[PDB]
Symmetry: C2
Subunit: 449 residues, 2 copies
């Protein structure tokens, strides 16, 4: 009877008052899911729990102590049970795309067997070859254009009504979305950082009155020459939902961003240029000057990287539905030749979401596709969870290569101790800085605004 | 004027209804933070925005479309401005404790400079050695028991009231909490699952009445032998707040768990027996028997692992407060020798929490220590934000080693096509099975419920 974070619900109805049909989560429970509750709160928020206890936002390390609050963390009085576990991803080794599909589609234990049992549990008939008495066994795996078809082998002769019409399991419409959070790198091959130059000088306040309201700003541009290899071909078909900054490693800093909805192998490197945008606002006492320093750098890195790409695809089951032993909601007995497709990956619509239908299996208005509750009474809550936990298991391919970058950048503008005497007195040799890789470098003393 | 995700508050009062002193977040605002709002929502949760618009939970891919809901995502009508930015973590490689601490503390850019400036901005005097005009330079970092002290060098003479009384930045009381989520693993060295045996038999329905409503269940014991190495000593002082199961890699199922509050290096292996409890619900027709199968495996895995430990510590600033330029709330001008600790990491209390004091700087009765608003007027909001961001930047140390496991388990109980002719006639050789490492194995038949 564990509490399912995702069923929790926050209410604002007074001390210890839950919305209708829910009840308060007590500390004991709050403790077991502490991580998930704090994660849904504001930094300094205080929400109430049962029997004079409260739980605090991450700002408070999620402390749970005695207290009162007008809002309450509530949980269903009649909790929906048997959620589908989320197993750890099945890592597929990088390779060419076919290398990846092959390894997935021919995996008996992790794919063929479990998707087959699904079709079987749903109601499809003859999901297995004539050479086995068990389901998901003796199955030919045939290529069919882009997708793959998995059917029971007919070789020889079978015996049973329409036993000759084996169920097909079509796998198609593959996509590989790169997960920027799975970044990882090896031994930092090349690494080093040099101080190519320090720009020094003064800012002066020639008056008898001190000065504040003036921003000292330094602008200019520099560059970063980078490159990344892509050991395999799958790279050509992997994309990111949204752009991102390449992770920092070591000390050296970089300015690199990968585009979204664009191939990973098409963004193999290049030379981009960066701005310089510091703007300090120092106070200089009348008849005085502060020393101002600016350090210029040049560093570079080399290291093997590795990101993970989530593999998603369409699962299509087609054959005919059993007699007095079916899971469609109408429960046909005319052996209709059904054709359904679930999407194994991000939500698309209710019809294709095993997870959706399964989690709303109790709101009658929602059960418009598969009667998940029926499969549960037929095989038992466990067999169903486990079966689905395998089919919905996260499949991931690894994308690897080499990374190397060279960049130049400025440190911060630093001001020192004022000294007895706003205008600047710091020499810039536009020519020289340029030679070192710093362009249109300039320093502006301008009124604050 | 960005919306601060962590200032959001959910109310359950009806379409568009926010609690007092709060207003409904609109589309555009919801857009710019979509990632965070959807990350604070239950999987299938649907919450209202302004003007009949609704934002959906993560299970729905966080979709924003026209809709109505009972609860509303709200925002303050007077938010606290200028939140301290949260930078990207600073990853430090594995190594012995001192080495890890050294790499953090001896870091000028990420540590010395930022913490020095903090002390400078707060009013501490002489935060730098007399070899540099700039704050945070010519700093001597010395070992002070278990901590470290960063104090300005004193060689030679100095010039300034009590300038020989350099402020000291003392870093101490380090803690390291391993993040079970940070888990990563290299190339799977050893890996493979041998089918050591496959028990086969039949389940017979001695009646004319098609029996069902009873489930067959296998049960017994078998061991899992695991070992792991810890490359460095940082391990001896790291823990986990709560226990956890070791992550599943490949197919080889395991059952192993790390205890909480037990040094990582003290849990390097052992042999832990694991049970086995499969079960199926065979619906067998009249006068019939079905073939049942149970494959028993043996698999082993080996791979280098790596987690991440969050580094926390106390930061104490001590020196005297500058005259006419100070930030303690009472603003002393008697150059008192001050002493103060900040806890850099999880929350501990108000006095030692920069984030708290910063977010509550506009509540008069909350300003009992440092006057943050002062520093803003003294250096500018942007300068203060960037400094505190560097100072509060998350620091994670990496934990590494090798892991290897060898276990045994049963696959699911599979059943086949019922055949013309509940008791089980599946033979179990206790001795054979015990000789293969499978003990107390048995098959029971009981009422499905």
């Amino acid at each position: 009877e564990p509490v399912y974070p995702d069923q929790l619900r926050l209410f604002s109805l007074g001390q210890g008052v839950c919305g209708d049909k829910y009840r308060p989560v007590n500390r004991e429970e709050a403790q077991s899911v502490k991580s998930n509750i704090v994660g849904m709160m504001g930094q300094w928020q205080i929400s109430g729990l049962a029997n004079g206890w409260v739980i605090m936002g991450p700002g408070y390390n999620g402390e749970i102590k005695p207290g009162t609050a007008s809002n309450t963390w509530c949980y269903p009085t009649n909790p929906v049970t048997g959620e589908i576990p989320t197993l750890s991803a099945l890592d597929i080794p990088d390779g060419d795309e076919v290398d990846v599909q092959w390894r997935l589609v021919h995996d008996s234990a992790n794919f063929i067997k479990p998707t087959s049992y699904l079709a079987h549990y749903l109601g499809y008939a003859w999901v297995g070859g004539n050479h086995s008495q068990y389901v998901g066994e003796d199955m030919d795996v045939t290529r069919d254009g882009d997708g793959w078809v998995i059917r029971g082998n007919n070789d020889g002769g079978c015996d049973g009504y329409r036993c000759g019409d084996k169920t097909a399991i079509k796998v198609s419409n593959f996509a590989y979305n790169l997960d920027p959070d799975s970044f990882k790198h090896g031994d930092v091959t090349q690494s080093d950082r040099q101080l190519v130059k320090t720009v020094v000088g003064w800012a002066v306040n020639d008056s008898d009155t001190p000065q504040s309201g003036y921003d000292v700003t330094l602008r200019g541009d520099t560059a970063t020459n980078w490159s990344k290899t892509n050991t395999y071909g799958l790279s050509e078909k992997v994309t990111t939902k949204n752009k991102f900054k390449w992770p920092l490693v070591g000390e050296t800093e970089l300015s690199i961003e990968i585009a979204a909805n664009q191939s990973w192998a098409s963004q193999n490197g290049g030379s981009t240029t960066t701005s310089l945008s510091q703007s300090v606002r120092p106070t200089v006492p009348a008849r005085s000057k502060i020393p101002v320093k600016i350090e210029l750098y040049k560093a570079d890195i080399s290291y093997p990287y590795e990101f993970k790409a989530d593999v998603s695809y369409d699962l299509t089951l087609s054959g005919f539905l059993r007699w007095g032993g079916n899971a469609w909601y109408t429960h046909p007995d005319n052996r209709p030749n059904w054709n359904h497709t679930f999407v194994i990956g991000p939500y698309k619509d209710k019809a294709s979401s095993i997870r959706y239908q399964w989690d709303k299996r109790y709101i009658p208005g929602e059960v418009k596709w598969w009667d998940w509750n029926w499969t549960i009474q037929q095989n038992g809550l466990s067999t169903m969870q486990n079966n689905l936990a395998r089919v919905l298991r996260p499949v991931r391919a690894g994308i690897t290569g080499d990374f190397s970058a060279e960049s130049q950048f400025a440190g911060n503008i630093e001001i020192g101790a004022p000294v007895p005497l706003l205008r600047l007195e710091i020499p810039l040799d536009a020519q020289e800085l340029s030679g070192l890789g710093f362009n249109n470098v300039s320093l502006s003393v301008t009124p604050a605004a």
